[PDB]
């Protein structure tokens, strides 16, 4: 389960899901996933500064950790989200934040 | 409407042949195929506040718009003819619908904001600094149906976020929050600092203290 925790509510994306006894083959969605490279060949000046990136080369807007999966169980403020889980099977939680520090 | 395409030509001829040929056709390194982007995407460019730059650049200014809202639908229907997508939300009259776009949430046509699309903008609707050269913009000039269709007609290095990905509903309170949302004291202070203090302590120089 890919648990998105954002600005006041979940997202659950369902990354993979694979059965020991042997079932579900599932898969997440690659695609989605778009970088903040500020690479221009040129910034304010006129040449020479050709800046990549504050940070490895991106801008701290980038959101490339977070993953991004085919079935999302997004959390309205007005419905709130149920990550439904399968019974007696191994469930791995992959956990990330959208905006800021919180706690699951 | 045939008036509509009719007119959508003769505008489209003028304009952007240069960058889109012929029939919604992209020039190579000057601008993109317009089959497919629609009435909504025309309506998010030359109706929305960003309407393509002559100048090459990694932004546009949502420069005042060149084409009245007659042009714009004319212009739109040429592109969704020619191409076939997305169109702009409109009235039960036949106008770009914009009051009708405002969502009932603003709680979760909020929280939406936060997750999908806040973070490149501001939690506030202020704008975000981007990519290369690319900026996020201050969404407070734009009206319900500008709004709608910077999420339909996904911009440029904007996520696009089809019906299906953002409802038709969610749109709408995604607009109702990014809309809800949006000489004497210095110089008399210098005086009674600067020069009176500096007036004061060279009195107390030149004269005695008793
Ligand atoms: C604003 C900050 C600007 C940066 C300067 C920061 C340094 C401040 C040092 C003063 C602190 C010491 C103190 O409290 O007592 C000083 C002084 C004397 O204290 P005292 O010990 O109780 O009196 C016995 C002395 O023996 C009294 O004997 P005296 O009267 O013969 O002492 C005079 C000697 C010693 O006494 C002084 O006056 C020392 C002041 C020297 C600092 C001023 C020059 C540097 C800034 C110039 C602006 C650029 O005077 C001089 O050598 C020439 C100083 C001419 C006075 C000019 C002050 C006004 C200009 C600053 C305001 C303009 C701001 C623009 C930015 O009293 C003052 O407050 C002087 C005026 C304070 C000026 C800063 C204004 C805030
Ligand atoms: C004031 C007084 C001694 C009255 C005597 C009692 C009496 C007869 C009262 C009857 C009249 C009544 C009804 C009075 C109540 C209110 C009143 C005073 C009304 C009249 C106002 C008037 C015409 C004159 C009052 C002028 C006066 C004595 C002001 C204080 C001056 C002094 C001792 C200043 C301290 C010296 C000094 C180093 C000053 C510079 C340091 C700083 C920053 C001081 C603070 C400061 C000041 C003092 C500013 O004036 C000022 C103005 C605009 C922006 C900022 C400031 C500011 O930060
Ligand atoms: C250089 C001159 C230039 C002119 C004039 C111009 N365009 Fe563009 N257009 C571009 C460039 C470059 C982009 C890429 C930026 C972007 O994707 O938003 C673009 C983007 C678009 C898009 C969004 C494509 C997408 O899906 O991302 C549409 C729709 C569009 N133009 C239509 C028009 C119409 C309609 C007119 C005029 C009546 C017009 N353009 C005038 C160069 C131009
Ligand atoms: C990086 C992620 C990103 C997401 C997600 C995103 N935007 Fe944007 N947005 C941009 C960038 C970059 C532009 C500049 C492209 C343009 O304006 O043509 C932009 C363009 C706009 C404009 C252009 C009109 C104006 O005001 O100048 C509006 C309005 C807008 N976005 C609002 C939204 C709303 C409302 C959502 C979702 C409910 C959203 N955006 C989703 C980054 C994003």
Same mark, same amino acid.
């Given at each position: ?11 659950? &994306? ?16 690659? %695609? ?8 221009? %060949? ?10 990549? &990136? %504050?940070?490895?080369?991106?801008? %701290? ?41 919180? &706690?699951? | ?13 003028? !304009? ?16 993109? !195929? ?10 998010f460019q030359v109706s929305t506040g ?72 501001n939690f506030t609707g202020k704008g ?83």
């Open positions: 389960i890919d648990v998105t925790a954002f600005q006041w509510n979940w997202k659950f &994306g369902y990354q993979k899901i694979a059965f020991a006894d042997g079932s579900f083959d599932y898969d997440g969605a690659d %695609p989605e996933r778009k970088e903040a490279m500020t690479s221009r %060949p040129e910034g304010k000046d006129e040449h020479g500064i050709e800046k990549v &990136g %504050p940070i490895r080369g991106m801008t %701290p807007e980038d959101r490339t950790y977070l993953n991004f999966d085919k079935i999302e169980t997004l959390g309205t403020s007005s419905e709130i989200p149920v990550l439904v889980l399968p019974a007696g099977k191994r469930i791995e939680f992959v956990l990330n934040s959208a905006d800021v520090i919180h &706690g699951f | 409407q045939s008036a509509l395409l009719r007119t959508g030509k003769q505008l489209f001829e003028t !304009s952007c042949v240069s960058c889109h040929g012929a029939n919604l056709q992209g020039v190579p390194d000057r601008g993109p !195929s317009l089959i497919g982007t629609g009435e909504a995407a025309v309506y960003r309407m393509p730059a002559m100048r090459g650049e990694a932004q546009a200014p949502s420069k005042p718009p060149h084409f009245d809202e007659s042009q714009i639908d004319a212009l739109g229907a040429y592109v969704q003819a020619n191409g076939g997508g997305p169109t702009v939300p409109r009235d039960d009259h036949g106008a770009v619908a914009q009051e009708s776009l405002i969502g009932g949430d603003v709680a979760r046509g909020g929280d939406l904001f936060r997750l999908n699309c806040a973070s490149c903008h975000g600094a981007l990519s290369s050269g690319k900026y996020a913009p201050d969404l407070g000039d734009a009206n319900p149906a500008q709004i709608y269709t910077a999420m339909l007609t996904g911009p440029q290095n904007m996520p696009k976020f089809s019906d299906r990905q953002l409802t038709p509903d969610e749109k709408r309170d995604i607009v109702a929050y990014v809309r809800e949302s949006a000489g004497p004291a210095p110089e008399g202070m210098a005086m009674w600092i600067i020069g009176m203090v500096a007036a004061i302590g060279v009195a107390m120089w030149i004269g005695s203290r008793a």
